[PDB]
Amino acid sequence: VGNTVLHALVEVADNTVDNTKFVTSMYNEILILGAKLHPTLKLEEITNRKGLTPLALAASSGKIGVLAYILQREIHEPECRHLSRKFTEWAYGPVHSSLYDLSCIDTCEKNSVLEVIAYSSSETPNRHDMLLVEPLNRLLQDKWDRFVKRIFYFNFFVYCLYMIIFTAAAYYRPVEGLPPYKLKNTVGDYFRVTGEILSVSGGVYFFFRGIQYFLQRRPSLKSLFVDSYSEILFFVQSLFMLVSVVLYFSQRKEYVASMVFSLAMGWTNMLYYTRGFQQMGIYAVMIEKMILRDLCRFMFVYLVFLFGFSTAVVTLIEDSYNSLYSTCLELFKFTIGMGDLEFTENYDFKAVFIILLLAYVILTYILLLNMLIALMGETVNKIAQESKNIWKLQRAITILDTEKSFLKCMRKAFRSGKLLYRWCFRVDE
Amino acid sequence: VGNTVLHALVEVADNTVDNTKFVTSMYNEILILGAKLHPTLKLEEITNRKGLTPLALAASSGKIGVLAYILQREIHEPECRHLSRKFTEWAYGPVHSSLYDLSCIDTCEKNSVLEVIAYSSSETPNRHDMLLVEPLNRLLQDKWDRFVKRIFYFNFFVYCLYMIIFTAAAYYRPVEGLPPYKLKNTVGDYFRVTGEILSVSGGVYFFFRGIQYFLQRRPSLKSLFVDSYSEILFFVQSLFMLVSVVLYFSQRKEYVASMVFSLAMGWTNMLYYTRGFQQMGIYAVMIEKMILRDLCRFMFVYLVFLFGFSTAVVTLIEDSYNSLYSTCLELFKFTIGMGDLEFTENYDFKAVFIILLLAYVILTYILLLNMLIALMGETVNKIAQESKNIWKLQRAITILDTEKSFLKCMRKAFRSGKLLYRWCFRVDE
Amino acid sequence: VGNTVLHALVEVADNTVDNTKFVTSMYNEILILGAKLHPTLKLEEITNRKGLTPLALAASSGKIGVLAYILQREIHEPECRHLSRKFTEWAYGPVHSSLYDLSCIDTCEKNSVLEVIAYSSSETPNRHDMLLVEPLNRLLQDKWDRFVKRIFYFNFFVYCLYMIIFTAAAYYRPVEGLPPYKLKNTVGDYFRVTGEILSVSGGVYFFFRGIQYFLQRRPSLKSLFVDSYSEILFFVQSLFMLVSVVLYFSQRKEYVASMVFSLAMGWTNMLYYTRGFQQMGIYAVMIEKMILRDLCRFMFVYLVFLFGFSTAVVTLIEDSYNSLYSTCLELFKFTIGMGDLEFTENYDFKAVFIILLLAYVILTYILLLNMLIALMGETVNKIAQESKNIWKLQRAITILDTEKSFLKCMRKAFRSGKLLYRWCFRVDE
Amino acid sequence: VGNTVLHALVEVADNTVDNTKFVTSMYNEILILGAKLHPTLKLEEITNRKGLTPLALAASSGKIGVLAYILQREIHEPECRHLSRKFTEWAYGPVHSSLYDLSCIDTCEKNSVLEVIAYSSSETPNRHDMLLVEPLNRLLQDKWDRFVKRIFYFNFFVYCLYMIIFTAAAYYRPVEGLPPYKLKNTVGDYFRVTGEILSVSGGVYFFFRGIQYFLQRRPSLKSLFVDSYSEILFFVQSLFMLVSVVLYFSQRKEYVASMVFSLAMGWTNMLYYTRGFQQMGIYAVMIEKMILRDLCRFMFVYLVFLFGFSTAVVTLIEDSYNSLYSTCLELFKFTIGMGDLEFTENYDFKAVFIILLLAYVILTYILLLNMLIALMGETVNKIAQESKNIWKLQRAITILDTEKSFLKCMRKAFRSGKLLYRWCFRVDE
Numbered sequence A, B, C, D: 001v002g003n004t005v006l007h008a009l010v011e012v013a014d015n016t017v018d019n020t021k022f023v024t025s026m027y028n029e030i031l032i033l034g035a036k037l038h039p040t041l042k043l044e045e046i047t048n049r050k051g052l053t054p055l056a057l058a059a060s061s062g063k064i065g066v067l068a069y070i071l072q073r074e075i076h077e078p079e080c081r082h083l084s085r086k087f088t089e090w091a092y093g094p095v096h097s098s099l100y101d102l103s104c105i106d107t108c109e110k111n112s113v114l115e116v117i118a119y120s121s122s123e124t125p126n127r128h129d130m131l132l133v134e135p136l137n138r139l140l141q142d143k144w145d146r147f148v149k150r151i152f153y154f155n156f157f158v159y160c161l162y163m164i165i166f167t168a169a170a171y172y173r174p175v176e177g178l179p180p181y182k183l184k185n186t187v188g189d190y191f192r193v194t195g196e197i198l199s200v201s202g203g204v205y206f207f208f209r210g211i212q213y214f215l216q217r218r219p220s221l222k223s224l225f226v227d228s229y230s231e232i233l234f235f236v237q238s239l240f241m242l243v244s245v246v247l248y249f250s251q252r253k254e255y256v257a258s259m260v261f262s263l264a265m266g267w268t269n270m271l272y273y274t275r276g277f278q279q280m281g282i283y284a285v286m287i288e289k290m291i292l293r294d295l296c297r298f299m300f301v302y303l304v305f306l307f308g309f310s311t312a313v314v315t316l317i318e319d320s321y322n323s324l325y326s327t328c329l330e331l332f333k334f335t336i337g338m339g340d341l342e343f344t345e346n347y348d349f350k351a352v353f354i355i356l357l358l359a360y361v362i363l364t365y366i367l368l369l370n371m372l373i374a375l376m377g378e379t380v381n382k383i384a385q386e387s388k389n390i391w392k393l394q395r396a397i398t399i400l401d402t403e404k405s406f407l408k409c410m411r412k413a414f415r416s417g418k419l420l421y422r423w424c425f426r427v428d429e
């Protein structure tokens, strides 16, 4: 297959206890023997065919036990010490000054651990808990507090400012016919056009960030939304903004129709930032999961009921209200507690009409919505814990993005290590 | 009783571990003895008085342990090999190439394992997990993908086309008094009457499918709905369609009153197809259970409250609204969040009227509905797993129906097996 | 203390396994020894000052271990056989034909087992599962099917007929001032007054049944409602009916105000019968437990919010709506999804008014009601099983009432046993 | 660090079983040894640097094992038993007449056990369960019944009377312009102004109680609300009352705006007293927890959606409704089941407007609210058991407040102990 044994050791694991201990054993034996035989050449550096070291492979596939072992390897023996992943400085009883190597964790130049674990395919079974392995959890916490937190809040703040400017520009849009509109020398219009230009500028910036994202990642349609959800939403916002520009200069009023959707998305995309706050990000996570997972089925069923009874009632009535659309709305309104239940007298067979509406109300307003709540009930009872960590996963994503951009034309964003050397990082735990 | 010991061995099981091992033991003993004593005569063909082999008995009664043994039984000894149910071709470490016999599994011509599991009496305790026994799950998956998936989607699509034609025909029904109506030479009317003819044709087809179903199955009233729910709904749709035809030619306007229910049912019956999709079928299954199991109790209680307080308020008022029906609606509207709570002034004892309505609102709008939700809460926490499998059963039903119909006057729809020879099926697992 | 050893042996138990085995051991030893010493006199007949045998004491206090022992105790030794509670006739493998004595289990003349269980004080910890002890479950099932089922359905049916007559009489009440009203010789008047007479007759009958109930039971206020809930409701219906009679002849229109509550109460009392049907009685039990347990806390809190903010808003407005009652209703309507949220313009400080209403809406409509749902969620997840046994308890109550009344001036409601003898009852299980 | 070994022994625990036994062992051994070596000097009196004895330290930090031991520590060795915490008077079989010392439990003059538990920093992991340790539970129950219960009901009653007077005064406020208002010699004015004076007096009293509370406690902002919630609410009510006074004499009508919030605050603060009633205080606890914990996240998300789509729709429409506020209300009304869903025709692109509203309704009305319920569902399933103790904890707070105030210039609120002596307290258990 073109891979070394150490990768196959990764492939054969399954995160069970017996399996974990056995794979630990094989790692131990092969690493010590290889050290004794080829002390010049290091094995764990050697990549598989896809350019991943065994560490990154365990990270990529969700093999938490192997990964935990490899990150937690101390070698303190003659002629083997150089292969250690951690050491201990201070051997106090309750607390240890542990010291970890960061090789191929942030700097790998092919695929680092945070890269492969963070940007895995979403099938990776353990990406939620896998960051709780001590050195990674510690690094993300350190990077968060140290420099990324402030930049993230700045990004959130500037997004808020962008949205305030966009909202202000949109709300005070000119009302004349036939865009584009002449800038009047009054300062109010100067601010308006400035706001519009900044609004579009934000649109273009998000557009290009989205393109860079999809070009780098090349996600597939079958999993375009399971991952990459936020980026799609920002990208789509920008798409609507740009369409609004095109219509705005194409002498179409319809640009408003585009802008407002962008504006609506422009605001709701703020929830992207609430992700990464454990206290307040759970709603954004759960809205993502519900829309992607759960809305499709409920809304197919609901639309079957709405449409079926809608066409029943519109068939029944004859003569206002005679359109399928109007009756679709009138029957929708039962869902929002404003259904009139005798909204037309222009029809025949009152008993039929009322029986239909009562059947509709019982079927949706009572039966369907409660089953939605029932399913969500069992599910959330099962998956609150998984959302509570996918918060952390998105925080890791935020940190990786933050390091990638950094906007100084330099690489002085290192984490730690001031003592002889492979970028040691110290945890007192 | 008229049975052999092989069936009684099935009857004695109860799917407990000690019981399972013991029944396996007795099977092993009699298999070896039967081989050595009557090598010319096959055991498992031997039917009980009802023409059921021991395999189909273990399947029919829900005896998952015995079935799981029998389908997964390899005999590799001298003078006993011929009694094996499966063999192993490739003894690779993680995966095996097992080869299974399909004798009386899909082709029996009396009753097969899939037939007796899928069309069990619905008391069968383990019909949900019973298909998880490897060879059955593999057969259904294979035949689903291989032939039945496309035909099912075609059936769903044609049902969608039928429903679109029916809906279009119904919506554009003529408004002239006194049906039936003369065809006008304009093409719109030609399409209309063509749509009507196709609509009725679909009605007749579903009518006759339902009759064939009930004639073949002969279900009882006490369990007519617990099983066979979908077929009843399709049949009832067709019944309404036919009644609409009769009225349509009986010079009655009331055909509309019938057609719409068929129309309302026709669209709603689309959820039938949504069964068999693991994701999207969760709701349709639940609406089957919730209506059959849970609507009766809630609606008796609810109608007791609605009707009792309805009689109270209609008694109280005197003079518009004086009818029991109108007050029944006005008090229903509290259930849909549109109760006015002072909907009449033509009455006496304002304090009594308001106390009645407040008692009604608290009793239903707050207490009864929330208690429904509480009950469903416990239940769904307990039965999400059972729906998650009954998905599989509906998929099996779809497959068995598909094999039964097949509409070519030929039997070349087999799954597999071409080499020495009882329809060998390979599972690489 | 004035009781024998066996009562203390009952008292010392606590339904733990070690305790259960020990107490059964002491029972065994003392019963055999007492038989050897005093073969003339039986210990287990010996009553406390309260006239309770050790069996009825174990039953009364909720002691499953002792009770299950005593009811299921076979003694087949020389000079000890005579004190057995059950014997085994047919020792078939899977089923036994057991034969049980019913002495002091239905006929005691002081306090039988079904009496002390069904009419326990509701503190009895295990009355729910206590009927699952084989011979009691079997007795209640047999008595249910044999004669009590039909009588109960007849009782339910006659209550339905009474309620229909009452409802019909009330709905068609005369509308003229100053009751009572002279009848016209027309048949409508005769049916109305006949309906009224039967209505009152049902009222009086329920009144006297309630008095008989409370006189026999002598409940206390602190637990008047925790038990005896249904009897209180029937009694109160009757009280309202009688008050309606008094006002009806006291030349006051206000009799209507009374009648309707008895009418509404009357109809809702039908839920009493739904208890005893496992399929449909769960809602009646749930509503009983919810109203007694859970309505008080929610409605105090809710009324605090409704009243507090209601006083705030009525204070704020000045000038229609200026009364505290009207604003109480207007703020109630938010609870039923019909709150207008700008229902008055006759006030000052729109910002204050709206902030108040929004705070009110968030606090009740979104926050309080969902909290009710959350509490009930945890509770029902814990107590569905206990409701599922309160069904059994009310079944026992129904049967005991049925046997008590019986309305023939004879006692020939016995079930089985004709041969040498203490009312032998046979169970195949 | 300036502490003796006993405080460290307290610190090192973690309430695990092995830890519990080990720490009990070391503490026990060293205490006996020290008693043998320095019989003149008492150790447990020895405070840490913060002035806490080891008992109060174990109490302060949430250490159940250590505290349970120390409260339940009996020493029966020569020359050591004088340092026991309990003795046993009567060694009856099921119950013991235990006798406990209360030194530094209610009287310490630095920090007593009830002080450090009740007024812990709210991080203390077991404060809710800690009072279930027998002698404390007994102390609080005894003090509750003996004198505190009546005083608590009295102060609750007086708070109710204050609120009734305040409400009456506010409701009948004068309606002239320009406060303050001259009193007419009629009695109605005198009762009104008397009510106002008492209203303000209650305001001032609560103001000063709140100041005394915060001065004594010195809470921090980061945990001002996690603890001390009720006191903050009472204090804020008083602040609003005082602001109302200032405006009332500052010749501003706006005093009404302040008073009503105090009024709405005041009535709502009545829920404070439901805490400490297990039957009815659960809702106050759950509302505290919801508002502090859960409202912030939901309302940020909800306001993002409401505001985002509000800006969308208000942008879209042009011409009544053109303001952002009005559209914010119109879209809020969907949340309360009164959304009109076609509330304006003064706009363009009906399709866009309706799609926006439908997206808004689905996103909030169906999607956001139901998942608030889902999240709470998991939470309450996990935390009803902890609120069920937070009740008792607040009862402890009530008792400590009661003992602190006592308003007689005497200390005659002791429990028992009159013979040789450290306030012996008897528990018969």
Ligand SMILES: C=C(C)[C@]12C[C@@H](C)[C@@]34O[C@](Cc5ccccc5)(O[C@@H]1[C@@H]3C=C(COC(=O)Cc1ccc(O)c(OC)c1)C[C@]1(O)C(=O)C(C)=C[C@@H]41)O2
Binding pocket: A229, A230, A231, A232, A233, A234, A236, A261, A264, A265, A268, A269, A270, A271, A272, A275, A284, A285, A287, A288, A291, A295, D356, D358, D359, D360, D362, D363
């Ligand atoms: C591509 C995704 C699936 C999406 C994009 C648009 C069309 C969207 O419709 C949806 C489908 C939809 C349509 C109508 C109602 C509900 C959902 O949901 C989101 C998407 C749905 C959202 C809600 O999703 C969120 O913003 C929450 C969120 C959670 C976590 C995140 O990381 C996040 O990043 C932006 C956003 C709001 C809309 O963008 C919106 O405001 C409009 C008018 C339509 C919603 O498609």
Ligand SMILES: C=C(C)[C@]12C[C@@H](C)[C@@]34O[C@](Cc5ccccc5)(O[C@@H]1[C@@H]3C=C(COC(=O)Cc1ccc(O)c(OC)c1)C[C@]1(O)C(=O)C(C)=C[C@@H]41)O2
Binding pocket: A356, A358, A359, A360, A362, A363, B229, B230, B231, B232, B233, B234, B236, B261, B264, B265, B268, B269, B270, B271, B272, B275, B284, B285, B287, B288, B291
């Ligand atoms: C025989 C069954 C029990 C049924 C047949 C009719 C009368 C039906 O009323 C019910 C009872 C009912 C009446 C009024 C409101 C709710 C339920 O539910 C279904 C039946 C109820 C349905 C909803 O249940 C379904 O059809 C969904 C479904 C789920 C799974 C399936 O396999 C399926 O196969 C078609 C259908 C819709 C109605 O057919 C409909 O649209 C009208 C106007 C009445 C509904 O009876």
Ligand SMILES: C=C(C)[C@]12C[C@@H](C)[C@@]34O[C@](Cc5ccccc5)(O[C@@H]1[C@@H]3C=C(COC(=O)Cc1ccc(O)c(OC)c1)C[C@]1(O)C(=O)C(C)=C[C@@H]41)O2
Binding pocket: B356, B358, B359, B360, B362, B363, C229, C230, C231, C232, C233, C234, C236, C261, C264, C265, C268, C269, C270, C271, C272, C275, C284, C285, C287, C288, C291, C295
């Ligand atoms: C004595 C009980 C507690 C009760 C008696 C009356 C006043 C009652 O108000 C209650 C309190 C109440 C008032 C207003 C709204 C809800 C509850 O609930 C019942 C009682 C509440 C009921 C609902 O409870 C039931 O009847 C269901 C029930 C369940 C199990 C049963 O065994 C049962 O026996 C009849 C009845 C309906 C009312 O009788 C009714 O219809 C009117 C107008 C008031 C209701 O008091």
Ligand SMILES: C=C(C)[C@]12C[C@@H](C)[C@@]34O[C@](Cc5ccccc5)(O[C@@H]1[C@@H]3C=C(COC(=O)Cc1ccc(O)c(OC)c1)C[C@]1(O)C(=O)C(C)=C[C@@H]41)O2
Binding pocket: C356, C358, C359, C360, C362, C363, D229, D230, D231, D232, D233, D234, D236, D261, D264, D265, D268, D269, D270, D271, D272, D275, D284, D285, D287, D288, D291, D295
């Ligand atoms: C400081 C707290 C957090 C609080 C103080 C005021 C502003 C309050 O708004 C809140 C926030 C708020 C605002 C609007 C709607 C909901 C919540 O909730 C309470 C506070 C919220 C309450 C409801 O919370 C409670 O008081 C119940 C309660 C539970 C336990 C207690 O020990 C308790 O002691 C008083 C009170 C009602 C208000 O006081 C009220 O009536 C008005 C008009 C605003 C509510 O802030």
